[PDB]
Amino acid sequence: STGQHPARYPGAAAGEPTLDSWQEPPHNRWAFAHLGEMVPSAAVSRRPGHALARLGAIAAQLPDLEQRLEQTYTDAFLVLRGTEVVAEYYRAGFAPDDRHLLMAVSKSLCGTVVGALVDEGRIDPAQPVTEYVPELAGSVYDGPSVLQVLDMQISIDYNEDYVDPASEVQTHDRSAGWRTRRHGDPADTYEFLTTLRGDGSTGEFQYCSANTDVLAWIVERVTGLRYVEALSTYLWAKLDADRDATITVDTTGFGFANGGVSCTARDLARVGRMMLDGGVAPGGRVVSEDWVRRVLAGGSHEAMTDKGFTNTFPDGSYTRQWWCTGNERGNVSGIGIHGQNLWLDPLTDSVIVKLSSWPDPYTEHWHRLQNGILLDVSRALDAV
Amino acid sequence: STGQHPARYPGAAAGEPTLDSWQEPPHNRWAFAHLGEMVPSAAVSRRPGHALARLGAIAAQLPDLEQRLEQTYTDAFLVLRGTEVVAEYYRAGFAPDDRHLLMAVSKSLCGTVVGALVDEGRIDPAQPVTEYVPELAGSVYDGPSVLQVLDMQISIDYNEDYVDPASEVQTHDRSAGWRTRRHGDPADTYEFLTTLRGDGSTGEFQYCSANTDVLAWIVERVTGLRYVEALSTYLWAKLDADRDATITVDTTGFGFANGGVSCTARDLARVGRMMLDGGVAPGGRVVSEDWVRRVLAGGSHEAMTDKGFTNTFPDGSYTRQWWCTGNERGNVSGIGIHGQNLWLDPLTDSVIVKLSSWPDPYTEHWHRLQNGILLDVSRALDAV
Numbered sequence: 065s066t067g068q069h070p071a072r073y074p075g076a077a078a079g080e081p082t083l084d085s086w087q088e089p090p091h092n093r094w095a096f097a098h099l100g101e102m103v104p105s106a107a108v109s110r111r112p113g114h115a116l117a118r119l120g121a122i123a124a125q126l127p128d129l130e131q132r133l134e135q136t137y138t139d140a141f142l143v144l145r146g147t148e149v150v151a152e153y154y155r156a157g158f159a160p161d162d163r164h165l166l167m168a169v170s171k172s173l174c175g176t177v178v179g180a181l182v183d184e185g186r187i188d189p190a191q192p193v194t195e196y197v198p199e200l201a202g203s204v205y206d207g208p209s210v211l212q213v214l215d216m217q218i219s220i221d222y223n224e225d226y227v228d229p230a231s232e233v234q235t236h237d238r239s240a241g242w243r244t245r246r247h248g249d250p251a252d253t254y255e256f257l258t259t260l261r262g263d264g265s266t267g268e269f270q271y272c273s274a275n276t277d278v279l280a281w282i283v284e285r286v287t288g289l290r291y292v293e294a295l296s297t298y299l300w301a302k303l304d305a306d307r308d309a310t311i312t313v314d315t316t317g318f319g320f321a322n323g324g325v326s327c328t329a330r331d332l333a334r335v336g337r338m339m340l341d342g343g344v345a346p347g348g349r350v351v352s353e354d355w356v357r358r359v360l361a362g363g364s365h366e367a368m369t370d371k372g373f374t375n376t377f378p379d380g381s382y383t384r385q386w387w388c389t390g391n392e393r394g395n396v397s398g399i400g401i402h403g404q405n406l407w408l409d410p411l412t413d414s415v416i417v418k419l420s421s422w423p424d425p426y427t428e429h430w431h432r433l434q435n436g437i438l439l440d441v442s443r444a445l446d447a448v
Numbered sequence: 449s450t451g452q453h454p455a456r457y458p459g460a461a462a463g464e465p466t467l468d469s470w471q472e473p474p475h476n477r478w479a480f481a482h483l484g485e486m487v488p489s490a491a492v493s494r495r496p497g498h499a500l501a502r503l504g505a506i507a508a509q510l511p512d513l514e515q516r517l518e519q520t521y522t523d524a525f526l527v528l529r530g531t532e533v534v535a536e537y538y539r540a541g542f543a544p545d546d547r548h549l550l551m552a553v554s555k556s557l558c559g560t561v562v563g564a565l566v567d568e569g570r571i572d573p574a575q576p577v578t579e580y581v582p583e584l585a586g587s588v589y590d591g592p593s594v595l596q597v598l599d600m601q602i603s604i605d606y607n608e609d610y611v612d613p614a615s616e617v618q619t620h621d622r623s624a625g626w627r628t629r630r631h632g633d634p635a636d637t638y639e640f641l642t643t644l645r646g647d648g649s650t651g652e653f654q655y656c657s658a659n660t661d662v663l664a665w666i667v668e669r670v671t672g673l674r675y676v677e678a679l680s681t682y683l684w685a686k687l688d689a690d691r692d693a694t695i696t697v698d699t700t701g702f703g704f705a706n707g708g709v710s711c712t713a714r715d716l717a718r719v720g721r722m723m724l725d726g727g728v729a730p731g732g733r734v735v736s737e738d739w740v741r742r743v744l745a746g747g748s749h750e751a752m753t754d755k756g757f758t759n760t761f762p763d764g765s766y767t768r769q770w771w772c773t774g775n776e777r778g779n780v781s782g783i784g785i786h787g788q789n790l791w792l793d794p795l796t797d798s799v800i801v802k803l804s805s806w807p808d809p810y811t812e813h814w815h816r817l818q819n820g821i822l823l824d825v826s827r828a829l830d831a832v
């Protein structure tokens with residue numbers, strides 16, 4: 065048993081509706097207005113073939129930039145300097161206002177929602193996860209603090225290998241509806257989380273996508289809101305975004321917080337703009353100045369033992385669902401597999417969004433190229 | 449084997465991607481921009497509780513209208529007289545720009561796409577279905593003409609009972625992803641259609657949702673477009689709609705043409721406006737004047753033996769995916785279960801959209817109430 069969860073609609077029974085019940089009352093009043101939450105669905109365009117390249121000023125300093133974007137399978141690229149869009153690129157077949165899957169850049173959005181609730185005093189990071197989700201007793205999340213979840217500092221038997229069919233990541237995907245269920249699989253994400261185990265140690269960085277879904281579960285328990293609604297109320301609805309974002313949901317309606325958000329490049333940049341504005345957005349304060357400052361400051365360097373990340377960023381770290389380079393520019397980034405970045409360059413007051421589709425989830429090859437582009441673009445924004 | 453189908457994206461292999469392959473190249477470039485087509489997904493609102501009632505002029509003639517709308521579980525109601533919205537109602541919790549499932553009003557949209565292709569000379573209604581879909585040989589659709597599909601005049605062993613778990617409608621739903629698959633179920637909608645049988649007779653009306661999906665299959669074979677794209681290119685993109693529509697898709701990406709479209713009430717009214725404008729929309733001609741005239745003229749009365757429909761509309765009929773009342777006003781309507789109507793009142797140059805969620809799919813009770821409202825509203829628009 066995973067305890068109380070936010071109803072899909074007001075008054076809904078646990079787990080209702082399902083794929084087999086949404087046409088029945090009382091579910092159908094909700095389902096007929098939200099069918100994409102139940103059944104895969106395609107857009108029928110209201111609008112009746114070539115890449116759009118407006119790389120602007122930075123083009124002079126980076127003449128081959130468009131080629132480098134093509135080489136890294138770039139779908140959308142946008143640079144916001146201050147409040148101004150100063151460079152844009154969209155591949156052939158991808159419109160400026162099309163949405164793109166964020167993968168684990170989604171985690172940085174979830175951390176932001178958690179931060180908002182910390183500012184309200186509804187979450188204390190020092191408290192154990194079980195203070196908010198008692199049902200995680202007996203799991204690897206029995207003992208660790210919420211901050212250790214936020215900082216990915218829990219040792220977990222979870223193989224985060226995105227191409228291994230035997231890995232826990234694929235079981236995670238199957239539990240959440242990203243892959244086809246196997247017999248005996250957990251029924252939903254909450255159940256999957258309760259199955260996770262570890263040796264009990266904490267304090268060393270281990271990237272684990274399950275951690276973010278635990279954060280989303282905590283958000284639900286503290287607010288009583290579906291994570292989908294909490295993500296809107298505490299973040300998205302304050303951005304003055306052009307479009308709604310979307311998030312994949314599992315069979316209970318639980319949003320896939322660790323990887324399942326999609327949005328436009330321009331709208332994602334608004335999240336970066338909020339961070340560089342000390343936590344304030346057009347619709348109000350999203351998180352405290354202190355929270356933003358702690359993100360920019362980084363996590364414990366000694367906890368960060370990931371050789372791949374530190375080979376590129378020796379003084380790098382991770383905190384509050386953000387990767388921190390610890391480089392001379394103080395760059396921090398949300399990062400997702402296949403080449404998604406929400407990259408912050410505080411020195412130039414700039415945000416870089418890059419949304420891509422590398423053939424591979426993550427290799428040193430793509431990592432080197434991607435970071436080379438983001439760093440070069442950042443430096444191109446420097447006063448000369 | 450069901451033959452050639454439009455690829456989900458340019459160059460895609462048959463049936464690709466699946467739920468298990470969309471993260472792999474080359475599929476992921478497409479999937480990351482269209483994930484809602486693969487995995488159920490929720491909107492994260494960019495906007496930060498009471499019914500909106502603007503029933504306007506007709507309120508004086510129908511003082512109790514709002515109550516009657518509540519009694520029939522109305523979610524959205526809109527009256528367009530000429531080019532002007534003259535009355536609107538939206539229930540608490542449903543915004544004016546929210547989309548709503550159309551159920552079989554979707555069929556009237558599909559018929560419109562077929563009509564466009566007839567005008568282009570790419571479909572001849574007199575030709576057998578097998579002229580366009582040879583793979584339907586050996587099925588109940590081997591022999592009948594395309595027009596007989598359009599007019600629902602084929603005898604089929606298909607129990608269109610929406611609450612019977614043993615009915616062909618539920619098998620249809622399971623094949624298309626509206627319900628959970630059972631072992632041994634057809635893999636997709638195309639396969640399901642090939643399993644249908646009948647005694648071979650034609651000429652009498654039998655409402656069968658499978659007919660519309662055969663029409664959509666024909667559309668795909670003649671255009672080479674996914675039905676989702678054909679619905680946009682030939683109809684939706686010419687309407688100057690406020691929002692995209694959506695349509696549920698099965699595991700091959702085939703749109704559920706018989707029932708799966710969702711859109712806003714105001715945008716649906718644009719379809720009615722196009723019909724009353726002789727087939728022309730803001731973005732160009734959608735169908736010929738002749739096609740519209742034949743819809744308004746009705747089908748063969750003698751074919752219409754459905755006692756429920758004819759008890760209300762004695763001179764009623766059905767043609768080209770529209771229900772024709774044959775009443776003194778010449779009303780014609782798209783109709784969907786649980787209370788969806790795209791209702792045309794040519795006398796007053798008006799369109800009535802009513803989108804609802806009756807607890808039951810279809811009963812004489814709801815039928816009587818729904819039609820009573822539409823007729824009363826139509827008459828309230830008359831010159832006095």
Ligand SMILES: NCCCCCC(=O)NCCCCCC(=O)O
Pocket residue numbers: 166167168169233236237273322323370372373399400401426431
């Ligand atoms: N299957 C659910 C998980 C989907 C999100 C995974 C993801 O995007 N992970 C990002 C890993 C970034 C690693 C950065 C680095 O090592 O340098």
Ligand SMILES: NCCCCCC(=O)NCCCCCC(=O)O
Pocket residue numbers: 550551552553617620621657706707754756757783784785810815
């Ligand atoms: N399960 C797929 C079918 C969903 C659409 C069915 C539908 O909306 N049918 C409309 C029936 C209208 C009957 C009108 C009458 O008999 O008066």
